[PDB]
């Protein structure tokens, strides 16, 4: 499957793509404002994610740091990134269908649209100014708007036992972005697409 990753932000981002235990494609790349990078993701990939990283520095070997979404200091991510990260999440060719969503469960750094470029389903979007509107206690000094699990490490926010409810913090993410997961047990906003669809992830769509 192809994923064109487009940075419409006025700032550089470093795109990242991983399934948690491995890179997808090269795993990451710099995207200056306006740039597009197309990756190939193997059919059947389960639990893939794409995200933006901000404020990165990498040496010539591809090792370094980012302020949001850093993945073990690598340009080319093999693992998931450090919150806060707005997440484009997907599982492909799962009993013949693909499934896509956006999640704020690991916080929000950069607005995003995640849409198919082929027929048969809708896209999803979280493009509101969550960083600007972020509750004081969730603001990350390194940049972005943390989720409450990251900040407070409670069973309720982290849904550790699988029984949690919505919270004042989750409700903030949900109010700003109804179409994204705001906590683990949120009413799903996952979209079913035809198996083997192709996609575009656009940072700063609006």
From Swiss-Prot:
It holds the Pfam family Thaumatin. It is found in: Cytoplasmic vesicle. It comes from the Eukaryota. GO terms for cellular component: cytoplasmic vesicle. Disulfide bonds join 9-204, 56-66, 71-77, 121-193, 126-177, 134-145, 149-158, 159-164. InterPro entries: Osmotin/thaumatin-like_sf (IPR037176), Thaumatin (IPR001938), Thaumatin_CS (IPR017949). Keywords: Cytoplasmic vesicle, Disulfide bond, Signal, Taste-modifying protein. The keyword Repeat does not apply. Its main location: cytoplasm. Taste-modifying protein; intensely sweet-tasting. It is 100000 times sweeter than sucrose on a molar basis. Belongs to the thaumatin family. This is Thaumatin I. It comes from Thaumatococcus daniellii (Katemfe).
């Amino acid at each position: 499957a192809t994923f064109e990753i487009v940075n419409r932000c006025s700032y550089t981002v470093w795109a990242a793509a991983s399934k948690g235990d491995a890179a997808l494609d090269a795993g990451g790349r710099q995207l200056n404002s306006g740039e597009s990078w197309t990756i190939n993701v193997e059919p059947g990939t389960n639990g893939g994610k794409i995200w933006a990283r901000t404020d990165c520095y990498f040496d010539d070997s591809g090792s370094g740091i980012c302020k949001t979404g850093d993945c073990g200091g690598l340009l080319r991510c093999k693992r998931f990134g450090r919150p806060p990260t707005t997440l484009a999440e997907f599982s492909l060719n799962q009993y013949g269908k693909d499934y896509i969503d956006i999640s704020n469960i690991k916080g929000f750094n950069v607005p995003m649209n995640f849409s198919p470029t082929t027929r048969g389903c809708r896209g999803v979007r979280c493009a509101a100014d969550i960083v600007g509107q972020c509750p004081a206690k969730l603001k990350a000094p390194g940049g972005g708007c943390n989720d409450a699990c990251t900040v407070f490490q409670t069973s309720e926010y982290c849904c550790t036992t699988g029984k949690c409810g919505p919270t004042e913090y989750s409700r903030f993410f949900k109010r700003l972005c109804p179409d994204a997961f705001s906590y683990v047990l949120d009413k799903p906003t996952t979209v079913t697409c035809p198996g083997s669809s192709n996609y575009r992830v656009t940072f700063c769509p609006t």
